[PDB]
């Protein structure tokens, strides 16, 4: 059904590097150059206070819509990924439901500034205190710490491309019907990522990558915090939360 | 519903 569902040659692995990097380039929601330029554009003490004074439900809704928009670009990235559209729909949905949020969490390090511990949010950079109204300080600080640790790796756009391809194509996701097909596609993407690192003398980052349990913890923490919020404001979830967000998380 | 729609829309 696809060349990457079988053993690929070196030349075919080189093509895969280029294909993933291209799919990533085209599905970037935010340009790296725009993100770095915006670093000096920081929310004022008054803007911070204004976000903090927003009701818990209002803040949750704004964050849910922004997450949804990020997810939309990840679905497009998946569709453009070699072999993804050749998997069955059950498997595509299994991969996106378990991995979309994980991809968004990795992509986030680009919009995060390790210098002053700020993140790009609604046009400006702000510290974690910006999200205080959400009432999930442990999750937010765990998200800022993850972005901080990925920032210290100084990933290129091509490294993010390949590492995110691998975050999504995980043959271990519960519910995959064509597991062996996912295993071969995963093997080839692993080879494409490790090949690119070898060629660019960047293999030293492999031991530095976060353990898989780290992305899972962040994802389980998001699911848990959403359950607490849903109990408090069930009609907010039902009436004002985006349908794609709910399909993925509830 | 949405995920299905996004995957099928080319
Ligand atoms: O916000 C949550 N999940 C989330 C994760 C990644 C994301 C987005 C949302 C969407 N964002 S954003 O709202 O512009 C933004 C920008 C920067 C930092 C954050 C921060 F810290 F909140 F994660 C958010 C783009 C970055 O990708 C979240 C949470 F943490 C707790 C409860 C409920 C929710 Cl919805
Ligand atoms: Na960064």
Tab-separated table of N, CA, C and O in Angstrom, chain A residues 120-216:
chain	number	residue	atom	x	y	z
A	120	UNK	N	4.450	32.509	23.482
A	120	UNK	CA	3.644	33.297	22.579
A	120	UNK	C	2.190	32.829	22.758
A	120	UNK	O	1.897	31.627	22.753
A	121	UNK	N	1.310	33.786	23.071
A	121	UNK	CA	-0.091	33.556	23.356
A	121	UNK	C	-0.860	34.807	22.926
A	121	UNK	O	-0.543	35.895	23.404
A	122	UNK	N	-1.865	34.649	22.025
A	122	UNK	CA	-2.726	35.742	21.536
A	122	UNK	C	-1.948	37.016	21.137
A	122	UNK	O	-2.292	38.112	21.579
A	123	UNK	N	-0.880	36.840	20.356
A	123	UNK	CA	-0.077	37.940	19.815
A	123	UNK	C	1.103	38.453	20.616
A	123	UNK	O	1.899	39.251	20.091
A	124	UNK	N	1.232	38.057	21.899
A	124	UNK	CA	2.391	38.512	22.681
A	124	UNK	C	2.985	37.384	23.504
A	124	UNK	O	2.391	36.322	23.602
A	125	UNK	N	4.156	37.612	24.080
A	125	UNK	CA	4.808	36.664	24.965
A	125	UNK	C	4.407	36.991	26.405
A	125	UNK	O	4.346	38.159	26.790
A	126	UNK	N	4.093	35.954	27.166
A	126	UNK	CA	3.712	36.085	28.563
A	126	UNK	C	4.201	34.900	29.356
A	126	UNK	O	4.331	33.799	28.801
A	127	UNK	N	4.472	35.133	30.648
A	127	UNK	CA	4.893	34.093	31.587
A	127	UNK	C	3.723	33.189	31.952
A	127	UNK	O	2.584	33.454	31.565
A	128	UNK	N	3.975	32.133	32.716
A	128	UNK	CA	2.923	31.200	33.112
A	128	UNK	C	1.822	31.823	33.972
A	128	UNK	O	0.689	31.336	33.955
A	129	UNK	N	2.130	32.960	34.635
A	129	UNK	CA	1.143	33.692	35.434
A	129	UNK	C	-0.046	34.184	34.595
A	129	UNK	O	-1.081	34.491	35.151
A	130	UNK	N	0.103	34.215	33.263
A	130	UNK	CA	-0.916	34.615	32.284
A	130	UNK	C	-2.153	33.663	32.336
A	130	UNK	O	-3.298	34.086	32.139
A	131	UNK	N	-1.896	32.382	32.640
A	131	UNK	CA	-2.872	31.288	32.676
A	131	UNK	C	-3.416	30.965	34.089
A	131	UNK	O	-4.061	29.932	34.249
A	132	UNK	N	-3.161	31.842	35.099
A	132	UNK	CA	-3.572	31.650	36.501
A	132	UNK	C	-5.082	31.402	36.734
A	132	UNK	O	-5.422	30.588	37.598
A	133	UNK	N	-5.965	32.012	35.897
A	133	UNK	CA	-7.418	31.860	35.977
A	133	UNK	C	-7.921	30.451	35.642
A	133	UNK	O	-9.020	30.083	36.086
A	134	UNK	N	-7.118	29.655	34.890
A	134	UNK	CA	-7.462	28.264	34.536
A	134	UNK	C	-7.598	27.361	35.764
A	134	UNK	O	-8.303	26.357	35.706
A	135	UNK	N	-6.874	27.684	36.828
A	135	UNK	CA	-6.870	26.877	38.041
A	135	UNK	C	-6.242	25.503	37.853
A	135	UNK	O	-6.759	24.496	38.363
A	136	UNK	N	-5.137	25.444	37.079
A	136	UNK	CA	-4.358	24.212	36.917
A	136	UNK	C	-2.860	24.539	36.805
A	136	UNK	O	-2.213	24.285	35.788
A	137	UNK	N	-2.333	25.146	37.880
A	137	UNK	CA	-0.943	25.613	38.027
A	137	UNK	C	0.106	24.550	37.857
A	137	UNK	O	1.159	24.838	37.288
A	138	UNK	N	-0.171	23.324	38.324
A	138	UNK	CA	0.759	22.200	38.206
A	138	UNK	C	0.883	21.818	36.751
A	138	UNK	O	2.008	21.717	36.266
A	139	UNK	N	-0.264	21.678	36.022
A	139	UNK	CA	-0.206	21.371	34.603
A	139	UNK	C	0.570	22.445	33.803
A	139	UNK	O	1.460	22.092	33.047
A	140	UNK	N	0.258	23.715	33.999
A	140	UNK	CA	0.899	24.828	33.309
A	140	UNK	C	2.408	24.874	33.550
A	140	UNK	O	3.164	24.994	32.589
A	141	UNK	N	2.840	24.774	34.815
A	141	UNK	CA	4.263	24.759	35.108
A	141	UNK	C	4.941	23.523	34.520
A	141	UNK	O	6.050	23.665	34.046
A	142	UNK	N	4.258	22.351	34.480
A	142	UNK	CA	4.776	21.110	33.864
A	142	UNK	C	4.886	21.304	32.346
A	142	UNK	O	5.802	20.758	31.731
A	143	UNK	N	3.980	22.104	31.751
A	143	UNK	CA	4.012	22.394	30.307
A	143	UNK	C	5.182	23.343	29.999
A	143	UNK	O	5.901	23.117	29.033
A	144	UNK	N	5.377	24.368	30.833
A	144	UNK	CA	6.467	25.356	30.695
A	144	UNK	C	7.834	24.664	30.909
A	144	UNK	O	8.783	24.958	30.191
A	145	UNK	N	7.911	23.712	31.843
A	145	UNK	CA	9.150	22.960	32.123
A	145	UNK	C	9.527	22.066	30.960
A	145	UNK	O	10.714	21.955	30.633
A	146	UNK	N	8.514	21.456	30.311
A	146	UNK	CA	8.735	20.573	29.156
A	146	UNK	C	9.285	21.366	27.971
A	146	UNK	O	10.251	20.937	27.341
A	147	UNK	N	8.660	22.518	27.674
A	147	UNK	CA	9.057	23.441	26.611
A	147	UNK	C	10.474	23.949	26.923
A	147	UNK	O	11.312	24.022	26.021
A	148	UNK	N	10.736	24.278	28.201
A	148	UNK	CA	12.052	24.705	28.662
A	148	UNK	C	13.118	23.650	28.380
A	148	UNK	O	14.157	23.986	27.827
A	149	UNK	N	12.837	22.376	28.703
A	149	UNK	CA	13.759	21.283	28.464
A	149	UNK	C	13.962	20.981	26.968
A	149	UNK	O	15.081	20.681	26.565
A	150	UNK	N	12.917	21.130	26.136
A	150	UNK	CA	13.058	20.954	24.682
A	150	UNK	C	13.823	22.126	24.090
A	150	UNK	O	14.568	21.924	23.135
A	151	UNK	N	13.635	23.354	24.648
A	151	UNK	CA	14.331	24.576	24.192
A	151	UNK	C	15.859	24.459	24.327
A	151	UNK	O	16.593	24.943	23.461
A	152	UNK	N	16.317	23.785	25.391
A	152	UNK	CA	17.733	23.554	25.706
A	152	UNK	C	18.406	22.629	24.689
A	152	UNK	O	19.634	22.540	24.674
A	153	UNK	N	17.607	21.944	23.836
A	153	UNK	CA	18.139	21.056	22.806
A	153	UNK	C	18.448	21.812	21.531
A	153	UNK	O	19.108	21.257	20.646
A	154	UNK	N	17.925	23.056	21.410
A	154	UNK	CA	18.092	23.951	20.255
A	154	UNK	C	17.774	23.262	18.929
A	154	UNK	O	18.563	23.327	17.986
A	155	UNK	N	16.621	22.574	18.883
A	155	UNK	CA	16.145	21.862	17.713
A	155	UNK	C	16.088	22.743	16.499
A	155	UNK	O	15.613	23.883	16.588
A	156	UNK	N	16.453	22.171	15.337
A	156	UNK	CA	16.251	22.820	14.047
A	156	UNK	C	14.781	22.503	13.665
A	156	UNK	O	14.151	21.612	14.279
A	157	UNK	N	14.264	23.186	12.628
A	157	UNK	CA	12.920	22.961	12.083
A	157	UNK	C	12.834	21.557	11.489
A	157	UNK	O	11.772	20.938	11.545
A	158	UNK	N	13.960	21.058	10.928
A	158	UNK	CA	14.051	19.709	10.359
A	158	UNK	C	14.056	18.643	11.463
A	158	UNK	O	13.432	17.612	11.292
A	159	UNK	N	14.690	18.917	12.612
A	159	UNK	CA	14.676	17.981	13.739
A	159	UNK	C	13.260	17.833	14.336
A	159	UNK	O	12.816	16.718	14.574
A	160	UNK	N	12.540	18.940	14.487
A	160	UNK	CA	11.164	18.965	14.986
A	160	UNK	C	10.270	18.185	14.053
A	160	UNK	O	9.454	17.381	14.514
A	161	UNK	N	10.444	18.416	12.733
A	161	UNK	CA	9.751	17.706	11.662
A	161	UNK	C	9.850	16.210	11.874
A	161	UNK	O	8.831	15.538	11.967
A	162	UNK	N	11.075	15.686	11.985
A	162	UNK	CA	11.303	14.251	12.123
A	162	UNK	C	10.912	13.681	13.456
A	162	UNK	O	10.407	12.568	13.506
A	163	UNK	N	11.176	14.415	14.550
A	163	UNK	CA	10.824	13.966	15.889
A	163	UNK	C	9.286	13.923	16.048
A	163	UNK	O	8.774	12.981	16.665
A	164	UNK	N	8.556	14.915	15.478
A	164	UNK	CA	7.066	14.912	15.557
A	164	UNK	C	6.432	13.835	14.728
A	164	UNK	O	5.397	13.298	15.138
A	165	UNK	N	7.049	13.492	13.577
A	165	UNK	CA	6.586	12.372	12.718
A	165	UNK	C	6.604	11.090	13.548
A	165	UNK	O	5.629	10.324	13.568
A	166	UNK	N	7.699	10.896	14.276
A	166	UNK	CA	7.863	9.746	15.161
A	166	UNK	C	6.940	9.759	16.400
A	166	UNK	O	6.450	8.723	16.798
A	167	UNK	N	6.656	10.928	16.970
A	167	UNK	CA	5.712	11.056	18.092
A	167	UNK	C	4.309	10.520	17.661
A	167	UNK	O	3.671	9.751	18.382
A	168	UNK	N	3.882	10.882	16.461
A	168	UNK	CA	2.611	10.439	15.889
A	168	UNK	C	2.617	8.964	15.411
A	168	UNK	O	1.652	8.245	15.673
A	169	UNK	N	3.669	8.521	14.686
A	169	UNK	CA	3.664	7.131	14.185
A	169	UNK	C	4.304	6.208	15.214
A	169	UNK	O	5.501	5.933	15.180
A	170	UNK	N	3.477	5.795	16.172
A	170	UNK	CA	3.833	4.947	17.309
A	170	UNK	C	2.973	3.678	17.237
A	170	UNK	O	1.767	3.724	17.440
A	171	UNK	N	3.602	2.560	16.897
A	171	UNK	CA	2.946	1.272	16.731
A	171	UNK	C	2.463	0.655	18.056
A	171	UNK	O	1.790	-0.361	18.034
A	172	UNK	N	2.764	1.295	19.182
A	172	UNK	CA	2.350	0.822	20.484
A	172	UNK	C	1.015	1.382	20.934
A	172	UNK	O	0.477	0.884	21.918
A	173	UNK	N	0.472	2.412	20.235
A	173	UNK	CA	-0.828	2.997	20.618
A	173	UNK	C	-1.898	1.916	20.722
A	173	UNK	O	-2.140	1.222	19.724
A	174	UNK	N	-2.523	1.737	21.913
A	174	UNK	CA	-3.646	0.771	22.027
A	174	UNK	C	-4.751	0.971	20.973
A	174	UNK	O	-5.162	2.105	20.726
A	175	UNK	N	-5.201	-0.117	20.347
A	175	UNK	CA	-6.297	-0.057	19.382
A	175	UNK	C	-5.965	-0.106	17.912
A	175	UNK	O	-6.867	-0.083	17.070
A	176	UNK	N	-4.680	-0.137	17.595
A	176	UNK	CA	-4.198	-0.193	16.216
A	176	UNK	C	-4.485	-1.574	15.671
A	176	UNK	O	-4.064	-2.571	16.251
A	177	UNK	N	-5.254	-1.627	14.592
A	177	UNK	CA	-5.626	-2.885	13.943
A	177	UNK	C	-4.463	-3.439	13.096
A	177	UNK	O	-4.135	-4.625	13.206
A	178	UNK	N	-3.822	-2.565	12.290
A	178	UNK	CA	-2.678	-2.932	11.444
A	178	UNK	C	-1.349	-2.505	12.094
A	178	UNK	O	-0.593	-1.701	11.547
A	179	UNK	N	-1.089	-3.067	13.265
A	179	UNK	CA	0.091	-2.835	14.097
A	179	UNK	C	1.429	-3.034	13.330
A	179	UNK	O	2.276	-2.156	13.396
A	180	UNK	N	1.605	-4.175	12.612
A	180	UNK	CA	2.803	-4.507	11.816
A	180	UNK	C	3.060	-3.446	10.742
A	180	UNK	O	4.208	-3.033	10.551
A	181	UNK	N	1.993	-2.980	10.065
A	181	UNK	CA	2.081	-1.886	9.085
A	181	UNK	C	2.592	-0.616	9.792
A	181	UNK	O	3.505	0.031	9.282
A	182	UNK	N	2.040	-0.287	10.996
A	182	UNK	CA	2.488	0.891	11.771
A	182	UNK	C	3.937	0.707	12.242
A	182	UNK	O	4.728	1.652	12.199
A	183	UNK	N	4.295	-0.521	12.635
A	183	UNK	CA	5.660	-0.838	13.067
A	183	UNK	C	6.691	-0.571	11.954
A	183	UNK	O	7.758	-0.034	12.214
A	184	UNK	N	6.374	-0.965	10.718
A	184	UNK	CA	7.293	-0.753	9.619
A	184	UNK	C	7.422	0.729	9.270
A	184	UNK	O	8.540	1.222	9.083
A	185	UNK	N	6.299	1.444	9.215
A	185	UNK	CA	6.306	2.891	8.964
A	185	UNK	C	7.126	3.622	10.056
A	185	UNK	O	7.975	4.454	9.722
A	186	UNK	N	6.928	3.239	11.337
A	186	UNK	CA	7.652	3.772	12.493
A	186	UNK	C	9.175	3.504	12.364
A	186	UNK	O	9.965	4.431	12.508
A	187	UNK	N	9.557	2.252	12.058
A	187	UNK	CA	10.948	1.840	11.827
A	187	UNK	C	11.643	2.753	10.804
A	187	UNK	O	12.727	3.262	11.093
A	188	UNK	N	11.007	2.968	9.634
A	188	UNK	CA	11.485	3.832	8.543
A	188	UNK	C	11.646	5.312	8.939
A	188	UNK	O	12.696	5.914	8.675
A	189	UNK	N	10.652	5.869	9.650
A	189	UNK	CA	10.716	7.229	10.200
A	189	UNK	C	11.814	7.341	11.288
A	189	UNK	O	12.503	8.380	11.386
A	190	UNK	N	12.011	6.265	12.079
A	190	UNK	CA	13.095	6.228	13.087
A	190	UNK	C	14.452	6.359	12.386
A	190	UNK	O	15.266	7.210	12.757
A	191	UNK	N	14.651	5.535	11.343
A	191	UNK	CA	15.799	5.492	10.449
A	191	UNK	C	15.998	6.855	9.784
A	191	UNK	O	17.129	7.340	9.761
A	192	UNK	N	14.905	7.487	9.263
A	192	UNK	CA	14.993	8.819	8.622
A	192	UNK	C	15.461	9.891	9.625
A	192	UNK	O	16.314	10.726	9.296
A	193	UNK	N	14.915	9.854	10.866
A	193	UNK	CA	15.316	10.804	11.922
A	193	UNK	C	16.790	10.586	12.333
A	193	UNK	O	17.569	11.550	12.367
A	194	UNK	N	17.165	9.327	12.612
A	194	UNK	CA	18.534	8.986	13.029
A	194	UNK	C	19.541	9.225	11.899
A	194	UNK	O	20.650	9.679	12.164
A	195	UNK	N	19.130	9.000	10.642
A	195	UNK	CA	19.977	9.279	9.487
A	195	UNK	C	20.305	10.770	9.402
A	195	UNK	O	21.472	11.135	9.207
A	196	UNK	N	19.276	11.625	9.508
A	196	UNK	CA	19.444	13.068	9.425
A	196	UNK	C	20.375	13.573	10.550
A	196	UNK	O	21.221	14.431	10.292
A	197	UNK	N	20.211	13.035	11.779
A	197	UNK	CA	21.044	13.405	12.929
A	197	UNK	C	22.493	13.014	12.704
A	197	UNK	O	23.381	13.796	13.042
A	198	UNK	N	22.722	11.810	12.123
A	198	UNK	CA	24.058	11.288	11.805
A	198	UNK	C	24.764	12.215	10.803
A	198	UNK	O	25.889	12.632	11.045
A	199	UNK	N	24.052	12.590	9.731
A	199	UNK	CA	24.510	13.427	8.625
A	199	UNK	C	24.830	14.868	9.051
A	199	UNK	O	25.703	15.521	8.464
A	200	UNK	N	24.130	15.351	10.088
A	200	UNK	CA	24.257	16.713	10.629
A	200	UNK	C	25.039	16.742	11.957
A	200	UNK	O	25.103	17.800	12.598
A	201	UNK	N	25.614	15.580	12.377
A	201	UNK	CA	26.415	15.414	13.605
A	201	UNK	C	25.649	15.863	14.824
A	201	UNK	O	26.162	16.628	15.642
A	202	UNK	N	24.401	15.363	14.939
A	202	UNK	CA	23.473	15.727	15.990
A	202	UNK	C	22.933	14.530	16.768
A	202	UNK	O	21.925	14.687	17.469
A	203	UNK	N	23.603	13.340	16.665
A	203	UNK	CA	23.186	12.124	17.379
A	203	UNK	C	23.196	12.326	18.917
A	203	UNK	O	22.382	11.706	19.599
A	204	UNK	N	24.072	13.236	19.453
A	204	UNK	CA	24.174	13.544	20.896
A	204	UNK	C	22.843	13.972	21.537
A	204	UNK	O	22.683	13.854	22.759
A	205	UNK	N	21.882	14.428	20.712
A	205	UNK	CA	20.563	14.819	21.202
A	205	UNK	C	19.683	13.600	21.548
A	205	UNK	O	18.748	13.762	22.318
A	206	UNK	N	19.947	12.409	20.967
A	206	UNK	CA	19.104	11.219	21.232
A	206	UNK	C	18.937	10.858	22.717
A	206	UNK	O	17.800	10.769	23.177
A	207	UNK	N	20.054	10.770	23.474
A	207	UNK	CA	20.082	10.513	24.918
A	207	UNK	C	19.430	11.656	25.694
A	207	UNK	O	18.964	11.435	26.816
A	208	UNK	N	19.355	12.864	25.086
A	208	UNK	CA	18.787	14.075	25.704
A	208	UNK	C	17.284	14.259	25.493
A	208	UNK	O	16.692	15.148	26.102
A	209	UNK	N	16.674	13.464	24.620
A	209	UNK	CA	15.246	13.568	24.352
A	209	UNK	C	14.404	13.141	25.578
A	209	UNK	O	14.817	12.239	26.311
A	210	UNK	N	13.243	13.776	25.840
A	210	UNK	CA	12.423	13.349	26.992
A	210	UNK	C	11.929	11.893	26.889
A	210	UNK	O	11.676	11.421	25.772
A	211	UNK	N	11.778	11.157	28.024
A	211	UNK	CA	11.241	9.779	27.940
A	211	UNK	C	9.767	9.796	27.514
A	211	UNK	O	9.110	10.811	27.735
A	212	UNK	N	9.251	8.718	26.856
A	212	UNK	CA	7.852	8.682	26.362
A	212	UNK	C	6.785	8.896	27.439
A	212	UNK	O	5.739	9.524	27.171
A	213	UNK	N	7.083	8.411	28.645
A	213	UNK	CA	6.231	8.579	29.815
A	213	UNK	C	5.997	10.032	30.158
A	213	UNK	O	4.972	10.358	30.758
A	214	UNK	N	6.927	10.930	29.744
A	214	UNK	CA	6.823	12.374	29.989
A	214	UNK	C	5.657	13.005	29.192
A	214	UNK	O	4.846	13.718	29.792
A	215	UNK	N	5.557	12.719	27.865
A	215	UNK	CA	4.474	13.224	27.012
A	215	UNK	C	3.130	12.658	27.448
A	215	UNK	O	2.137	13.379	27.449
A	216	UNK	N	3.112	11.359	27.841
A	216	UNK	CA	1.913	10.667	28.317
A	216	UNK	C	1.381	11.324	29.608
A	216	UNK	O	0.168	11.540	29.732
